[PDB]
């Protein structure tokens, strides 16, 4: 069958909107009334790989764009990347590993951990207007945790 999606947001657990800030750039700040609305609407695909109760593989493309969030080595590092692809292939239900988080439910939030680099993690910064990145460390200044919204 087709790959099945939901249309979300997230906001990191300080509270942080999520908005594309520049070419493929993805920023973190503090949203409320009409600023928000420009706030990122992921289509968030639940995919092939390794699952359990708590742990469930998905990709995250933008809303209406050939774009997914992706997992590669940049000058010898595990980031976060923006990563295009061809319109007519994506979804998939076998996204490659690169576009994979593991969503982890703990304590009422959400964590995306890279499928590709283990114990790396969607993050943000304490402060406004920063890049959201791949993080490999918790229990730290970097947020590691979101919550989800479902959008129509
Ligand atoms: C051409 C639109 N570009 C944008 O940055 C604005 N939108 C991006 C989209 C993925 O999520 C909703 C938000 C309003």
Same mark, same amino acid.
């Given at each position: 069958?087709?790959?099945?999606?939901?249309?979300?947001?997230?906001? %990191?657990? =300080?509270?942080?909107?999520?908005?594309?800030?520049?070419?493929?750039?993805?920023?973190?700040?503090?949203? =409320?009334?009409?600023?928000?609305? &420009?706030?990122?609407?992921?289509?968030?695909?639940?995919? &092939?790989?390794?699952?359990? /109760? %708590?742990?469930?593989?998905?990709?995250?493309?933008?809303?209406?764009? /050939?774009? #997914?969030?992706?997992?590669?080595?940049?000058? %010898?590092?595990?980031?976060? &990347?923006?990563?295009?692809?061809?319109?007519?292939?994506?979804?998939?239900?076998?996204?490659?590993?690169? $576009?994979?988080?593991?969503?982890?439910?703990? /304590?009422?939030?959400?964590? $995306?951990?890279?499928? =590709? $680099?283990?114990?790396? #993690?969607?993050?943000?910064? =304490?402060?406004? /207007?920063?890049?959201?990145?791949?993080?490999?460390?918790?229990?730290? &200044?970097?947020?590691?945790?979101?919550?989800?919204? $479902?959008?129509?």
């Amino acid at each position: 069958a087709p790959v099945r999606s939901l249309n979300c947001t997230l906001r %990191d657990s =300080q509270q942080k909107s999520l908005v594309m800030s520049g070419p493929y750039e993805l920023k973190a700040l503090h949203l =409320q009334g009409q600023d928000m609305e &420009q706030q990122v609407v992921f289509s968030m695909s639940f995919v &092939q790989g390794e699952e359990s /109760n %708590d742990k469930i593989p998905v990709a995250l493309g933008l809303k209406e764009k /050939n774009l #997914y969030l992706s997992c590669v080595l940049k000058d %010898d590092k595990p980031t976060l &990347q923006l990563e295009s692809v061809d319109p007519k292939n994506y979804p998939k239900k076998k996204m490659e590993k690169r $576009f994979v988080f593991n969503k982890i439910e703990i /304590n009422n939030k959400l964590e $995306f951990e890279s499928a =590709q $680099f283990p114990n790396w #993690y969607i993050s943000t910064s =304490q402060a406004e /207007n920063m890049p959201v990145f791949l993080g490999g460390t918790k229990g730290g &200044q970097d947020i590691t945790d979101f919550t989800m919204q $479902f959008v129509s």
